[PDB]
């Protein structure tokens, strides 16, 4: 799924993925869209720093908690501090090392110093046509799924 994002073997990775869905449905993913016009996953650009922090009882919690609502509360409404952080997480014309350093500076000030970093990861966007084809192709071959939350 990562190589399907782009690079020397993107075509092979994409071929493997569309074959995998066709194996699920008995063929026909191709009746919904062209995978060579619509690559399966696009890059999100800003990559992911993973890690965890300890809470007040010493439990491990995901560092991703300082998300947009998280960061706004962490700065207690200081929008300028928020926007500096937010730009760090969005402007990807900025070399990732510079962004990583500022992201770590922000965790020490807002999350705390009890922060451990773990293996990093990529993020990408699933092509809306891949999604249409996967969901409809399964439903279209009769593998009906009921919603348990029938109304809210």
């Amino acid at each position: 799924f990562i190589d399907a994002l782009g690079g020397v073997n993107q075509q092979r990775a994409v071929a493997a993925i569309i074959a995998g869905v066709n194996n699920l449905i008995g063929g026909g993913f191709e009746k919904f869209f062209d995978h060579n016009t619509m690559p399966i996953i696009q890059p999100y650009g800003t990559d992911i720093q993973l890690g965890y922090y300890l809470d007040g009882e010493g439990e491990k919690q995901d560092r991703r908690d300082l998300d947009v609502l998280g960061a706004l509360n962490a700065s207690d409404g200081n929008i300028q501090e928020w926007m500096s952080w937010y730009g760090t997480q969005c402007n990807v014309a900025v070399h990732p090392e510079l962004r990583a350093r500022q992201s770590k500076n922000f965790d020490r000030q807002y999350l705390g110093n009890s922060v451990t970093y773990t293996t990093r990861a990529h993020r990408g966007i699933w092509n809306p046509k891949f999604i249409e084809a996967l969901d409809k192709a399964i439903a279209s071959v009769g593998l009906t799924v009921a919603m348990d939350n029938v109304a809210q």
Partner: peptide
């Protein structure tokens, strides 16, 4: 901006 590729296998 670019995608590096490591030595994946089985699917290619």
């Amino acid at each position: 901006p670019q995608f590096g590729v490591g030595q994946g296998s089985g699917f290619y």
